[PDB]
Ligand binder design. Structure first.
Ligand code: SF4
Ligand code: SF4
Lengths: 624, 626
């Protein structure tokens, strides 16, 4: 099938697309084909639905009609307001995730979270001292956790002048944010102000609207996401380099396969612990299974990969196909980027679709709500439902298509610095010498409009060939993994300088740094290098790219990378092209304001050319 | 012009529409006509733009295509998510307003707000004692204010189980909210969670989404709005009954006319103070003006009316027409519902359009940013700009069309209770006796799709005829005022029972209770009556109506009225009709959950029939006669 081949570059995707077609199961690609018309105005950003004087659409007509909304708003305001709410939704996704981590650490500190502990007490004391907890090195760990909880909760209040983790940014970058009015003050406050600004008759200046969009996204990267990353390491362990596998072949015919899906490790970490209890393992053996096999999907799978080495079944557009294998006995979901089509496809088989969060409700799903105080009990119940569903699996409909590909994961900043001997100096020297010319974080998703992982893999190959080290998060993890680029042996596919540095360190040329919230690790690493060198983040030879993005969260990540001084490439444009002024601001105007701008380029080789050109220019301004 | 007559019921609007037509000035009605080819999918709520796998539209096609979005979401999820974000935008409008009041009270308590004071120390001590401030009756006033500021800020945090003012609601209503998962916890938090829930692949159940929409709106009415109302009374005075005038005739040809527009009294109160300084009045007289005349627009005008008796120039669709009079020397705006067309229309005259808030930026406006620490200085500078613009006014293009209509305003709950002798008992006795059969809060805006104020005025007349007292806020204030219903003499236009009670108290049959944020006053009054009688708010003979609404803030008000147990009528439907399940939930399903539901009815007489039917049924459940 030429159509099936055009939808992905992977054999395991192709095999399940054939199977789904033979069984009459429609997938995300089929629904994408139906929605291709949609609305030109929605794509251009020139449709407004923010009050019922409208809806209004801005058109270019010879009679001059429909140039303004009923309230008088023009294309610039309407597009900027739509883009702002788009960003606020992405920031809110990371905000609630970070807030949930605070609640969990507070529950542990109060002794009200059976089965949860502080896995990394050393990191707890370090982070707490960094944020100003008195005597964080010597006081009882639960006292220290409670004080860190109070600081993090205060960043979710309305009385701070600047977020707590913002102190990591170099002084020149904080002074710039202050002059611009971009300093993030409260994680929830910026989201709430954006919704106020975008109400009819509030903020009607596209420049003002975009400035607060930067402030809202900065409250994510230096707030919601960074709190989520650091507290997750404290609760569940700081990642260290380890080996694992990826693709649909990680599912086992002889085992109970449980796929964790969503973003929150607070649930998936306890699911994993439940599968290790003797009575639970006995129920699986009583059912005829050889073992219980947990495999990861999306960001919560990335989290289990970084901290436990749990194999990854696939990324965004693989999620439906994982059920089509016939071996998915249960999907355990929390929230974000869980396509509701999985509920209907699970109904085609024996698969149980289990929801666990009060925020992630899916009509028709089996809801076993998980909170810290009952997670150990509830996650036990959830694994038992998976074992029961295993006994109802139809063996004739099982087809696990591929053999898993080996990967190396767990490259937190702590692991990176340890690999360098404890300081960033060897990394700076390699950059100064030109063996590593720069770094690019590839952090994108999948999008049905782009052949799955074609741009992710091509861009990754292009960059490491040019001695540009790649930092991979999100869906790119599975893409780079299946291409065999996440192992130390892949240095043979990097340039001479990068290959030599990788072989001397024993690391791959592509470092897996975690989930989408773990893009905050990349902010931290950039901030560390800039502070060490005494320059701004906008002076570093760095870049960010999302070749196949789709979600509001990806746009928020791109926005706070740009606002932090990181040139950011997107494979597809956001819904803003209906305003030339907003588009020019995103592509060019922001360069004069924050020292970086967006790039839109669907050709991954041309994308690599543009990212390299920025890296080269920044190398020149550093005198290298 | 038949078209001009069809656009409003008021003579002052007709004259300015005729004037605008001859001068080639397009108004909101003209732009509404251009946008009448409104997207069907946007109107039905079945278009989703929440990711760039889309946009997606759900259609009812013969070939069965486009039944689901690319992610698999159906019409129920897509409509419920769009409505949730719609509600969050309205709640965020009130949230930021209340937050600004907290900052102003904090600035006063620290002595960093020249020209601001605690105007109502007595209410400060009462509110602070109510929320748990230790020794609020005797401690220094600035110390008490600082502790109340801390309590209010904590409601804008993420560590509360329930908002502070939620304790006003009856226990039965709080227990119901708790079981349903509707208890509002943080003013900003509920807004943020709604944006998280409506992200792709998060909340994909329309019932769950609608329940959190109720929780988000409750964080407004019992949080952002209620904090805004009470702190505004503390900072600028608790309203008491007073006389004033309304309509475009409140503008004076011989004076410098300054129109305050927006929602925040922190700015308009200092503008008024600036126009009262002797040196500023001297510059106006030196320029040839008899005086400086401040007149109000929209909610900030409602606030100046309630606390200072400052006359109101007009409501939503009058804002453009006020500049067309040719006598508007300056518009001073803060934020919310300020149409950016005013900037272009001001450019057709001498009028200065001044913005004052970092949140309300308008391209091409004159920005003089106002904060508590510099408000006294900046507002003086702003009034001077108005005097200068007055000297450039074209006398030939001036046309102030009408004579002002007298109104009575200032009916805070404190004023109502004082008129009743200090307790609600005389009011309860009148309801039990059947002289006052029920209460309806009419809280709507204007909408170009409805002839201006035709439904607002007709519904108000229908209700008071049936002995149903009307509580008026927002744009309804100007509507009821211009019809002469905001004066005690209007008791002659009410039924026999309501007229007798009004004459016994000396009050109009329509009580102006303030701005849109002051709908929290109506929540407080309903909660007080329910608590006194030992029943739920859903047992009281009450209703709420928004016959001509348009904004997200209006939908948030309607949602938290319903969620609090108040049957709420809307003249126009929200963009939800593309989902029958969501529509059925809003119109019927919610009745079984929170004891009230939405009503959509564009006929104001039928709306009065439906509101009265609920009042009668609740009267029976209380064991009262009709
Ligand atoms: S806010 Fe303005 S542009 Fe948007 S729908 Fe309302 S009237 Fe139209
Ligand atoms: S969230 Fe779902 S329905 Fe909405 S645009 Fe994205 S794919 Fe389409």
């Amino acid at each position: 099938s030429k159509t099936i081949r055009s939808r992905s570059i992977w054999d395991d995707a192709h095999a399940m697309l054939e199977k789904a077609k033979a069984e009459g199961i429609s997938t995300v690609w089929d629904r994408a084909a139906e929605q291709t018309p949609a609305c030109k105005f929605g794509e251009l950003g020139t449709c407004c639905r923010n009050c019922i004087m409208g809806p209004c659409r801005i058109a270019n007509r010879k009679d001059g009609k429909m140039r303004l909304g009923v309230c008088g708003a023009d294309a610039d305001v309407i597009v900027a307001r739509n883009f702002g709410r788009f960003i606020a939704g992405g920031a809110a996704g990371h905000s609630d995730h970070g807030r949930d981590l605070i609640e969990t650490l507070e529950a542990v500190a109060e002794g009200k979270a059976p089965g949860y502990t502080i896995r990394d007490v050393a990191k707890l004391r370090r982070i707490a001292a960094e944020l100003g907890v008195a005597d964080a090195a010597t006081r009882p760990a639960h006292d220290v956790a409670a004080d860190l909880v109070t600081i993090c909760y205060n960043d979710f209040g309305s009385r701070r002048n600047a977020l707590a983790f913002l102190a990591r940014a170099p002084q020149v970058r904080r002074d710039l944010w202050q002059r611009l009015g971009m300093t993030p003050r409260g994680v929830d406050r910026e989201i709430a102000e954006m919704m106020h600004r975008t109400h009819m008759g509030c903020d009607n200046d596209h420049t003002s609207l975009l400035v607060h969009a930067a402030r809202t996204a900065l409250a994510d990267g230096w707030g919601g996401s960074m709190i989520g990353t650091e507290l997750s390491d404290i609760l569940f362990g700081t990642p260290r380099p380890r080996q694992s596998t990826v693709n649909l072949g990680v599912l086992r015919k002889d085992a109970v396969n449980i796929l964790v899906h969503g973003h929150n490790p607070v649930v998936s970490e306890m699911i994993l612990a439940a599968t290790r209890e003797p009575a639970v393992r006995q129920a699986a053996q009583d059912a005829g299974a050889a073992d219980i096999n947990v495999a990861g999907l999306c960001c919560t799978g990335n989290e289990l990969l970084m901290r436990q080495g749990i194999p990854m079944a696939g990324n965004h557009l693989m999620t439906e196909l994982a059920i089509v294998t016939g071996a998915a006995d249960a999907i355990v979901a929390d929230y974000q980027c869980i396509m509701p089509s999985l509920v209907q496809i699970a109904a085609c088989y024996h698969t149980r679709f289990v929801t666990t969060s009060p925020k992630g409700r899916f009509t028709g799903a089996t809801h076993v709500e998980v909170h810290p105080h009952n997670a150990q009990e509830r996650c036990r119940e959830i694994v038992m439902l998976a074992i029961d569903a295993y006994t109802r699996r139809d063996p004739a409909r099982v087809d696990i298509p591929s053999q898993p590909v080996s990967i190396m994961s767990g490259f937190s900043n702590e692991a990176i610095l340890e690999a360098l001997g404890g300081t960033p100096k060897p990394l700076i020297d390699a950059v100064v010498a030109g063996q590593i010319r720069g770094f690019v974080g590839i952090v994108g998703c999948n999008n049905p409009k782009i052949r799955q992982d074609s741009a992710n893999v091509t861009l990754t190959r292009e960059l490491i060939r040019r001695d540009i080290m790649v930092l991979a998060t999100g869906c790119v993890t599975t893409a780079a993994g299946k291409a065999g680029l996440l192992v130390p042996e892949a240095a043979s596919k990097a340039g001479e300088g990068l290959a030599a540095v990788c072989r001397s360190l024993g690391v791959p040329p592509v470092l897996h740094m975690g989930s989408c919230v773990d893009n905050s690790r990349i902010l931290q690493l950039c901030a560390l290098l800039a502070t060490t060198l005494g320059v701004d983040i906008s002076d570093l030879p760095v870049g960010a790219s999302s070749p196949e993005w789709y979600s509001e969260k990806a746009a928020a990540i791109a926005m706070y990378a740009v606002a932090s001084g990181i040139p950011t490439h997107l494979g597809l444009p956001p819904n803003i092209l209906g305003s030339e002024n907003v588009t020019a601001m995103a592509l060019h105007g922001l360069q004069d304001v924050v020292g970086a701008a967006f790039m839109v380029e669907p050709d991954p080789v041309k994308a690599a050319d543009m990212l390299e050109a920025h890296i080269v220019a920044r190398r020149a301004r550093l005198g290298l």
